[PDB]
Amino acid sequence: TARGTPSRFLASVLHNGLGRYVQQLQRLSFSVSRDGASSRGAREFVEREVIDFARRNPGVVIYVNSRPCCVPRVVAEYLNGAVREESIHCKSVEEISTLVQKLADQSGLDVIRIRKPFHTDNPSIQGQWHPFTNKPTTFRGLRPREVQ
Amino acid sequence: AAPKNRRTIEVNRCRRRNPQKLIKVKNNIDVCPECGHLKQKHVLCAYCYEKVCKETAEIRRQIGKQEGGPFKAPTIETVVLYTGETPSEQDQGKRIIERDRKRPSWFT
Amino acid sequence: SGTWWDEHLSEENVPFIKQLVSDEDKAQLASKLCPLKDEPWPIHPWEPGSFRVGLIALKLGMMPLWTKDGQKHVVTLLQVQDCHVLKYTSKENCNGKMATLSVGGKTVSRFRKATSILEFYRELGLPPKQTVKIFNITDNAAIKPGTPLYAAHFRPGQYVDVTAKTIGKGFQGVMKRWGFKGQPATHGQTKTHRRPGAVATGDIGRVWPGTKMPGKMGNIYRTEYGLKVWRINTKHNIIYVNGSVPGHKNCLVKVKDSKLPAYKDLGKNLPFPTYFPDGDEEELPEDLYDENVCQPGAPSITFA
Amino acid sequence: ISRKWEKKNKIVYPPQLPGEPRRPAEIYHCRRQIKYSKDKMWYLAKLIRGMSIDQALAQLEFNDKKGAKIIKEVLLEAQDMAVRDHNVEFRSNLYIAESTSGRGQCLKRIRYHGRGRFGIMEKVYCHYFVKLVEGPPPPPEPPKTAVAHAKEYIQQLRSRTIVHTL
Amino acid sequence: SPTELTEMRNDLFNKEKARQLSLTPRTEKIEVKHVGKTDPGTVFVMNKNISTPYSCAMHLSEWYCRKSILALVDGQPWDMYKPLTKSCEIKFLTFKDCDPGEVNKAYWRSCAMMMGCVIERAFKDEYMVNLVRAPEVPVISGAFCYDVVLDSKLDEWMPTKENLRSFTKDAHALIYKDLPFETLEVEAKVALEIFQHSKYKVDFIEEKASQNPERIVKLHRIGDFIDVSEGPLIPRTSICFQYEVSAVHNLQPTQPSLIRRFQGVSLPVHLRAHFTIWDKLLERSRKMVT
Amino acid sequence: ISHGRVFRRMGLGPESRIHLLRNLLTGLVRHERIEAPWARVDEMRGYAEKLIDYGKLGDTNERAMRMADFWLTEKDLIPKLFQVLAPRYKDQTGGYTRMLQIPNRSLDRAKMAVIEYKGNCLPPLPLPRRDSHLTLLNQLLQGLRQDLRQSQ
RNA sequence: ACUGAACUCCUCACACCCAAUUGGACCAAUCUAUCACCCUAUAGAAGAACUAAUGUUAGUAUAAGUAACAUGAAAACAUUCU
């Protein structure tokens, strides 16, 4: 709930799109197990997708750990320095693939309420309204009920 | 009559912690120039008073020894005397009470 | 820490300070006994619609007074003690229809007064007064501050209004405050003898404001209207007024001319700005009496 | 029961570099299981809450309440140990940092009413806690001036944005 | 120029103080016994040239520090903030003492000092202000006084009542600052380096150096202002609660050089008077005192 | 409502009131100095002073004997009243008793006063003493006094 | 003419607003079989889930620091007095 939670204004890291687009996902850390059903879905993700995924985005460094665990996870790290942990657990190759894509195309800015949808650094061109726009001028700048 | 609803902590905290129900600071405290203990002004020094009352307690004990029984209050005046002092000419003809110690500085 | 004036004075200095300040109050009273001689304000003759200043008097006590028709009228005695003019405020500044004169009462100690008040009285050149009351006056009635006032300010035959704080009866029950009947003493009546009855109607889910119920009684200002002045003693400055006056004995009352419609234009012959004894136009006798009053030391009354 | 407050005197900080402000000394002390109501004790705790040691001892001396002598004892004990063990130079330069009363463990007895009815009466106990900080006591925050009110009001008007636009 | 002169004197004061501090080998423990009526036989084991009567007081209670105005060291008046030298007997002196003779003398000596301080910085630079001294005056006399030589330009000039109220508020400001009266005892020479600009201070220093077998003289500093004093002073400025500069009087045989005796009266915080009584005391201080 | 009510109600009634006061007075006569609750000391104080005046009347006065008989329960104190206390206060016309406020009672937290007859044999009470004439303020006031006397 | 819905259109998404009742898709924790081995998997079992019964036990609040309760006096603490 909006009152019950924090808010941010819409932004990017370092005006991302302005010059050149930079992928914000920097590091990916996959924890899988050799045995055990939880890591099964993830196991075959490392059989096929990992390799071609890593080719697709050379910016991301991928680390696969392969140690005993009851819950396999993925640690997404971003340029700005945010860390996002996601438990892949008992998920099919396809829905794991969707996750890894979703991580790779987002920034490190936190997911809370985003206030205004639009953000301008120069909102006006002609000049912001003030109460002395579209109000006429007087001879010698005289106020009403002036003596002279 | 009976309360219709429980009073909350905030309501109660306003009752209890207002300056009216608080303890007020006393501003009439001073140092006893005699003994250096703390006394309230307008009141006798607690230390100094104890000191007097312990002396007067012992004097009353010596009064009992000499009087020796109830209903024997004398028809003369009284004077108290310490070690190495003598009654004067005007002291003659009044009740004498002796002591085994020196006269206090404060008692003259 | 709080300090009173005696904290740091030896036994030698105490009587000295006491006598010194006593001297100075006497000196300050001495200075101002000649108002007309000292550069005064213009004195205007009386015209209709004019209101003059009043006095501050102390209630001494009560006495009987007799009239020629043989009737007995109780009088209250009012002593005018160290009554002076304090401050004049114009009609503009006071934000009123009338201009205003401040009058002081019983002389009081400097040691028990507030800093600013002591400063105010220093500027005047008078010792501090106990009570202050404001009188609504017309422009012509203006009196230069510092001018003393006397009981001969009023004359017999004149009606006055008297206001003072009533006698304080503290928290009282409904029965003595509002004269509620209360409940019977016998025939049952369990623990209800002096209780207020039903407070309100059941239909209304409240109690109407300003309902009569037990509370703090007395100790409030009340005025008595149209009290005749039977007698003036000029030496002691005693006003003798008809009937009862509010407040205890040795209290300070505010006494001015009556407001009542019957006596609206009766101020013609009454000494307008104030009575000035220093004027020496005619030296007022020991006592002043009303026509009807039986004189103390006059022959026994016959109805023949 | 928890006894954290006692252990607070066993904290050792590592030695300071010469280029450092002198750390104030720090003493925690308490009394447990005082036969007195915790809320009644609060008023006395609250009273001495920010004052220097001596000034608190003065205020407590002439105070008529039962717990007042108890607190006096605790304060004198605390002052003594501050000088002796906590390496405080002067006994006078201490002020009460925090003064708190807690609920101690309580017993239940019976109260006999009319008919056969009864109630459960509680023998009330409480703890008192104190903390002493070496140095002069903190000067109280000054009352808010008209200029401060004005200053902040200006700040407040300047913070307005046109809302629900770009 | 005076603004540089004042800070120069400070630097000189500071360097001498630092020199006197440095010749002390670490810390030597002196023993000081309390010979007071109250709390007897107390022995304070103090630092040799560091610890003060104030430090002893603040071993005892705040009641001492609050209500201690002077010290007796071997029965000699001693500043509260003066560092000790050797083992001795110490007792403290208050205003409400039986014989506050020494205490009263010290109080007036200090008030006169701060009056001189405020007078100096009350006039603009185009005029010349020259402080000469504060003469020793019995407390039973009207008020304390400081003697001043002003510019020849201000020969006709007499201060108005508003000017007096001006000085009043100015001295009050000094009290509010609450400045300790730092003391320093030195040989004559270094003090002459401090005061060589005003001859009226030069000769006064020479007087004190001659009268004493040693060339020891006392210099009391109130924050920035340094002044030569004839004896011990009050610890802090806060001690004063009432302080009005009453009048200025011209001395009669002053055809060669005009002398203006500034007079004012003061009361400490412990002994404060009612409004009316203080007023009558001001009246007396308006009279010229000799 | 109770303006100008002089006596304060004390015991379990007016009879008891007198009886408590009489006990206090009896004590004070005998011992010459007594600690009691502040209200009761103040209340009894007046009757103590009034007793000395009756004592001043002498043994020969039959009225005074009857009064002393009632107010002193010990009957051995009556000689003391008339042959010790009355002679002692020969010079003074009034002011025989002094009363002071001392620290509150421990048990009760009651206001406590000591009352004593003046010029007794006992060690003297620590009494409030005004500051010395040599104080700074007193010296300045003495200064003002000097001005006024020497002006004329 | 304008304003004016969850009606209708628009960019995307779609099982995602009836009582009793009836049908269906999942699932917390626990034990067992076999896995797993920083807390899981597939099944088999079951005392398998509490915002409510003037529910039952324990703890702490509200009323509330409320109502209420209590020690004849002085003293040498011998004694005396009411």
Ligand SMILES: [Mg+2]
């Ligand atoms: Mg009736």
Ligand SMILES: [Mg+2]
């Ligand atoms: Mg019944």
Ligand SMILES: [Mg+2]
């Ligand atoms: Mg009845």
Ligand SMILES: [Mg+2]
């Ligand atoms: Mg029964």
Ligand SMILES: [Mg+2]
């Ligand atoms: Mg309970």
Ligand SMILES: [Mg+2]
């Ligand atoms: Mg009673």
Ligand SMILES: [Mg+2]
């Ligand atoms: Mg719409």
Ligand SMILES: [Mg+2]
């Ligand atoms: Mg629809």
Ligand SMILES: [Mg+2]
């Ligand atoms: Mg739909």
Ligand SMILES: [Mg+2]
């Ligand atoms: Mg399962």
Ligand SMILES: [Mg+2]
């Ligand atoms: Mg179940």
Ligand SMILES: [Mg+2]
């Ligand atoms: Mg539950």
Ligand SMILES: [Mg+2]
């Ligand atoms: Mg019920």
Ligand SMILES: [Mg+2]
């Ligand atoms: Mg219920």
Ligand SMILES: [Mg+2]
């Ligand atoms: Mg339930």
Ligand SMILES: [Mg+2]
């Ligand atoms: Mg409670």
